[PDB]
Symmetry: C2
Amino acid sequence: GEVKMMSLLEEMKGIYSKKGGKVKPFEKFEGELKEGYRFEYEKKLCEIDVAMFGLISGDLNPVHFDEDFASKTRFGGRVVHGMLTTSLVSAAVARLPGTVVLLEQSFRYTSPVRIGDVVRVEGVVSGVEKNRYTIDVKCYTGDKVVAEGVVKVLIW
Amino acid sequence: GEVKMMSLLEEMKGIYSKKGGKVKPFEKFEGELKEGYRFEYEKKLCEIDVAMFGLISGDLNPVHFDEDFASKTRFGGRVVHGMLTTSLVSAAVARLPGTVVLLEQSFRYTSPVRIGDVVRVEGVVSGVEKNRYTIDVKCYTGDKVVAEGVVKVLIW
């Protein structure tokens, strides 16, 4: 992995982008983390994201993949995996200043996310104990809440 | 993109497998879901899983990717994304009989996971209210708990 990883990542990035995936250059936020620090992160979730999430996890639930199957359900169409939506929260907190590790997450999924939706993560730091930061998080498509909850991160 | 999806998935499965990913064929579990129903699901997390998770989420945290950087943290090397580990829980519950959608998830990350680890998800249904099932979940590497929490699923 050392050189293997960044080489594999770069190789897969070129394929991923050509399949319609959005590349999010990785840049850390700045400022002083403390109660009330706010941040935001957004990404369009495309067919390739659903497919890749399915392969890496093994979650090939037809409700995310099969148009006629999903059309028959109460959702009336495919929906993105809920855990793909909230994967964006990992990306958002990873951009906080310092070295970031996830300790806790807790989400409720409130409305489905459709393929092609832009999901926006809004976080605000709510608690600080030593180097553990508690963060209130809501995920949106447009102005509609699609997930809500809390994460805790360790930041060195 | 109704019929582009299943073609995209099949094509990506080939690239994914060639890069070392484990293809986790999708088959449903069986039985009537009552309190005390227990299930397990496991998957080996490989370099390609970390890379793909990073691309789909945008989480390119150096702690998961950069050997030199990660080696200087207390982990002594790279660790996988916590949310990659618990993505396997989505895949586990997706296999429950019926049409499954995630309603809630809550996890604490207790010990890091590394490239090459087999993560085993153990679930037990702890409560049922109509078609909403509360499931206690622990993720393991061998005998060691790496994440623990609770999910709630809607099953039609």
